[PDB]
Design a protein around this ligand. Structure first.
Ligand SMILES: [Mg+2]
Ligand SMILES: [Mg+2]
Ligand SMILES: [Mg+2]
Ligand SMILES: [Mg+2]
Length: 154
RNA sequence: GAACGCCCCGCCGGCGGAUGCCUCGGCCCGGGCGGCGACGAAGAGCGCGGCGGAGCGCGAGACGCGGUGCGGACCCGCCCGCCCCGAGAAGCACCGACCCUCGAACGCAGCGCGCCCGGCGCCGCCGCCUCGGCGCCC
């Protein structure tokens, strides 16, 4: 699809992935948790989620997400450690930093995460069997993911 | 407080397939025509292309063969082939043939078997061959 970020007087690095086989709600929260970070920080932070040293806070899709001790100062008490969404976002981040560090020779020490947009895509459609002869749906909820890197926001 | 939610002050993305325009199709009326079959029909099965599934077509001569006319440069891919005052690609019309199994379906059965060395089903009409009767007579 097309890009949702339209700025025209910044030097940016961009990458996207269309139709990602990962939960939409999990992946939205992972991208919103790294917004505004410098790209050194977000790369460490994402490796810590993999190792259960930090959490992803959940501000939008949280009914049934458990409260945990690792989320004390964030604004909420709820979070999780989505391992498959962190695998996707890390690889999309590296393309955008490569795209920027190669089009204009800017270091990772002045790059920041300044935009994101997650959108709902069209899923795989299977079926499950219910009692008394009935059939029901069993679908996936995939996503489109985009991520922009550039200079410190102000 | 922030956030969630809600409204839109506006700028962009998704999901979905409405609206508009388009149409080798339907529907209605009128005119023709009225042309199947034991010389094996209608229908069914199986098989047939250099690379070939479906549908059209064809029948072991199988994605076609011949004859008379016409036509005159191509043959959707990859190849082949044709090319010329006739040498002949596409296309068209009539005519002659080929025409596996089942089916009115015809040696019996439906996939297996015979009688006889041509062959070998039922009904009816007309003839003919060979015959029966303590029918009527001689
Ligand atoms: Mg069940
Ligand atoms: Mg049942
Ligand atoms: Mg075929
Ligand atoms: Mg027969």
């Amino acid at each position: 699809v097309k890009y949702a970020f339209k700025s025209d007087n910044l030097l940016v690095g961009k990458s996207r992935r269309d139709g990602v086989k990962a939960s939409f709600k999990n992946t939205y929260s992972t991208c919103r948790a790294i917004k505004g970070m410098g790209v050194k920080r977000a790369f460490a932070y994402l490796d810590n989620v993999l190792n259960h040293k930090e959490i992803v806070p959940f501000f939008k899709f949280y009914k049934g997400v458990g409260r945990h001790s690792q989320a004390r100062g964030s604004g909420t008490d709820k979070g999780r450690w989505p391992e498959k969404s962190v695998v996707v976002v890390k690889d999309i981040l590296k393309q955008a930093v490569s795209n920027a560090k190669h089009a204009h020779k800017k270091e990772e020490d002045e790059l920041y995460v300044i935009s994101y947009c997650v959108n709902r895509a069209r899923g795989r459609r299977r079926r499950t069997f219910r009692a008394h002869g009935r059939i029901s749906k069993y679908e996936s909820q995939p996503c489109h993911v985009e991520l922009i890197v550039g200079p410190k926001p102000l």
